[PDB]
Amino acid sequence: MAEVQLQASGGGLVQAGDSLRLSCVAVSGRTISTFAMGWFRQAPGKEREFVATINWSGSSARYADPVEGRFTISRDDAKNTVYLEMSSLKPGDSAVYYCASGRYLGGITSYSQGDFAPWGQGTQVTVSS
Amino acid sequence: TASWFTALTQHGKEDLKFPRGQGVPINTNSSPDDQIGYYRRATRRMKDLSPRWYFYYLGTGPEAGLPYGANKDGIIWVATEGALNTPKDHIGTRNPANNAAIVLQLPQGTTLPKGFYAE
């Protein structure tokens, strides 16, 4: 396989209803600009889940149904970082969060796992009741 | 090791550039995920022949190590909507003894600089 080129951070232990802010940074020359981007999550003992996708320009975003209304995806191409702003967190939002590079000049309609690559190292988010 | 395609000769003063989403050669044995790479200028030279721009898939070729977007003189970057920013190791480069170059074709309506022509 390859070295990690995307790295997520900002995870921690939080209580229900608290908000957290995650970042995923392209490294080692990787750029996110003019590429769509995604956030995915793995709950313990559970499959990878689409969380959010933001298109190449930032105009448009799609969220998973559970995350709808509570998470907000953002991008800063100058710093090569994507962001997931999480609010009114629930114990079920407890998981490993990582981002992935999406398709060139894409967005929204492409929210499948095959629509992203490479994949980032994740950051653990834990929510207590 | 060589480009899978034939070069675009720069007949002009203007260097090769493409708008975003344009400039990737048509290869029907490649996928939407693959449609991304760079052109490398090579100038021949006693007189100086016109520069030739050769397309290499991202992660392949003389600048296989450069990530998409890197700045190097004579390197320009192209991609088609839907491509993924991963190295195209499966496509690779062309061995001239075993295989021969594909005539570079660009889709209808591709925007080219002055001095560049596509059959």
Author numbering:
A (entry chain D): -1 to 127
B (entry chain A): 49 to 93, 101 to 174
Quote the study on this structure.
The N protein plays several roles in the SARS-CoV-2 life cycle, including facilitating viral RNA production, suppressing host cells’ innate immune responses, and packaging viral genomic RNA into developing virions. To accomplish these tasks, the N protein possesses a modular structure with an N-terminal RNA-binding domain (RBD) and a C-terminal dimerization domain (CTD), plus three intrinsically disordered regions (IDRs) at the N- and C-termini and between the RBD and CTD. The protein oligomerizes through its CTD and disordered C-terminal tail, and the protein also undergoes liquid-liquid phase separation with RNA mediated by its RBD and central disordered region (8–14). Here we report high-resolution crystal structures of three llama-derived single-domain antibodies that bind the SARS-CoV-2 Nucleocapsid protein with high affinity.
We could further narrow the binding region of each sdAb to a defined subdomain: sdAb-B6 and sdAb-C2 each recognize the N protein RBD (residues 49-174), while sdAb-E2 recognizes the CTD (residues 247-364) and sdAb-N3 recognizes the C-IDR (residues 365-419). We first co-crystallized sdAbs C2 and B6 with the N protein RNA-binding domain (residues 49-174; referred to hereafter as NRBD), and determined structures of these complexes to 1.42 Å and 2.56 Å resolution, respectively. sdAb-B6 binds a separate surface on NRBD, burying 617 Å2 of surface area on each partner. The interface of sdAb-B6 with N is made up mostly of CDR1 (34% of the interface) and CDR3 (60%), with only a minor contribution from CDR2 (4%). At the core of the interface is a pair of aromatic side-chains from sdAb-B6, F33 and Y102, which together dock into a hydrophobic surface on NRBD. Two arginine residues, R28 and R101, also make specific hydrogen bonds with NRBD. For sdAb-B6, the most highly mutated residues in its epitope are NRBD residues T135, L139, and T141, which are mutated in only 1372 (0.28%), 976 (0.19%), and 402 (0.08%) of the 489,605 SARS-CoV-2 genome samples, respectively. The sdAb-C2 epitope overlaps two residues on NRBD, D144 and H145, which are mutated in 575 (0.12%) and 2010 (0.41%) SARS-CoV-2 genome samples, respectively. Both sdAb-B6 and sdAb-C2 contact residue P80, which is mutated to arginine in variant P1. Curiously, while sdAb-C2 had no effect on dsRNA binding (Kd=0.49 +/- 0.06 μM), sdAb-B6 significantly reduced dsRNA binding (Kd=0.82 +/- 0.11 μM).
